[PDB]
Design an enzyme around this catalytic site. Structure first.
Site, PDB file in Angstrom:
ATOM      1  N   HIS A 175      -6.059   0.708  10.672  1.00 16.44           N
ATOM      2  CA  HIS A 175      -5.587  -0.062   9.548  1.00 16.44           C
ATOM      3  C   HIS A 175      -6.572  -1.160   9.174  1.00 16.44           C
ATOM      4  CE1 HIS A 175      -3.305  -0.559   6.312  1.00 16.44           C
ATOM      5  NE2 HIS A 175      -2.751  -1.686   6.634  1.00 16.44           N
TER       6      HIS A 175
ATOM      7  N   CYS B 123      -6.230   1.663   2.308  1.00 15.97           N
ATOM      8  CA  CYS B 123      -6.088   0.325   2.858  1.00 15.97           C
ATOM      9  C   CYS B 123      -7.384  -0.482   2.768  1.00 15.97           C
ATOM     10  CB  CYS B 123      -5.529   0.377   4.272  1.00 15.97           C
ATOM     11  SG  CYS B 123      -6.451   1.444   5.399  1.00 15.97           S
TER      12      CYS B 123
ATOM     13  N   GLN C 286       0.854  -1.180   0.000  1.00 18.55           N
ATOM     14  CA  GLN C 286       0.000   0.000   0.000  1.00 18.55           C
ATOM     15  C   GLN C 286       0.892   1.233   0.000  1.00 18.55           C
ATOM     16  OE1 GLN C 286      -2.527   0.403   3.474  1.00 18.55           O
ATOM     17  NE2 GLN C 286      -2.695   2.640   3.188  1.00 18.55           N
TER      18      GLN C 286
ATOM     19  N   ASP D  83      -1.139  -7.254   5.093  1.00 26.73           N
ATOM     20  CA  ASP D  83      -1.143  -5.865   5.486  1.00 26.73           C
ATOM     21  C   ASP D  83      -0.215  -5.130   4.540  1.00 26.73           C
ATOM     22  OD1 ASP D  83      -0.948  -3.322   6.543  1.00 26.73           O
ATOM     23  OD2 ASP D  83      -0.941  -4.011   8.664  1.00 26.73           O
TER      24      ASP D  83
END
Length: 219
Positions: free
Chosen positions: A162, A97, A91, A177
């Site tokens: 997040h 996100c 990202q 992630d």
């Protein structure tokens, strides 16, 4: 501006309209809420679960634990990329996100999705397109994607949050992630139900350290 997006809220209805806009013409999957991580609440989740999405606030403790997992796992993560290949992107844009998480869920489940419309964002250059930086760059730069994200974000509108994505890969619960260098490995699993248990256990560890949990399931 181009390199800061509006935040997408965890909201299955908004997400389901979004994945339609991304190019799923007749989506055979959908996002639903997961109401919590107890066995009671997990029993309510439809089965199979193709992916678990989580929005959570980082705490320094959680970030710490993740650093240690990344450091403990470099070798095993490299092995897993070869043994059971999966889609992972970095990202590059702040607040992208929610979209990265949805991308992670969809692109790791293409077989489940239904038809992708020719010419759609999901048919786009990044989607065809290895390395998480390169893919990350193309996703960050796709103006159609940025515009669709904005519209979805606004639909949901009325602390460093997040948004992440858990998938089963080669007997492990894997967290994608885009703000971390590597996928993160959590518990082991052997079937779909034990994957949901492993994802829930990872989530519960941070809950004790609010959260939005969704799951990608069949429609």
């Amino acid at each position: 501006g181009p390199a800061m997006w509006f935040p997408l809220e965890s909201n299955p209805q908004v997400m389901n309209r979004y994945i339609s806009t991304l190019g799923l013409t007749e989506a055979k999957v959908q996002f639903v809420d997961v109401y919590g991580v107890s066995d009671d609440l997990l029993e309510m989740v439809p089965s199979p679960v193709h992916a678990v999405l989580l929005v959570y606030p980082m705490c320094e403790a959680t970030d710490r634990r993740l650093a240690e997992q990344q450091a403990a796992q470099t070798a095993e993560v490299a092995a897993l990329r070869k043994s059971h290949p999966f889609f992972f992107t970095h990202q590059l844009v702040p607040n992208a996100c929610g979209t990265i998480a949805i991308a992670h869920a969809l692109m790791n489940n293409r077989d489940k999705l239904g038809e992708i419309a020719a010419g759609s964002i999901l048919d786009g250059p990044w989607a065809k397109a290895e390395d998480p930086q390169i893919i990350g760059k193309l996703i960050a730069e796709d103006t159609s994607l940025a515009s669709a994200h904005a519209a979805a974000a606004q639909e949901g509108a009325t602390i460093d949050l997040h948004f992440v994505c858990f998938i089963p890969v080669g007997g492990r619960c894997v967290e994608l992630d885009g703000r971390k260098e590597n996928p993160i490995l959590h518990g082991t699993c052997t079937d779909n139900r034990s994957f949901l248990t492993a994802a829930a256990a990872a989530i519960q560890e941070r809950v004790e350290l609010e959260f939005g949990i969704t799951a990608l399931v069949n429609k």
